Amino acid sequence: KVFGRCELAAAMKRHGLDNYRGYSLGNWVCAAKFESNFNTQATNRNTDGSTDYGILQINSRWWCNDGRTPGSRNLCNIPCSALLSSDITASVNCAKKIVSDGNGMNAWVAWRNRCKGTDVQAWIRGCRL
């Protein structure tokens, strides 16, 4: 499903993502915009054979199991197809563990390059949260 901007912000806030680990809600909506264009079905293959899945492009080398990434881990204990659901519950729960491993939201390249140090609050403006 292709989320709306305010629709995704409301779903992320209900799942406890607002100010999670110090990252305001505008950071998560901004990252989802440039990682997947608010599309839960987004997939992208990396050079090393792994694939990014879902609204937040969670990588299969470490976090999910897609059955085709040799020598990879499944730290979120889920199949990568679960990250493509219209329900973003699995993607948010896995993202909570990713953002908590020490590097924060820098694990997402789009956030570091296109969201970090910007007016991330503008991504939730005009939304009834």
Ligand code: NA
């Ligand atoms: Na894996």
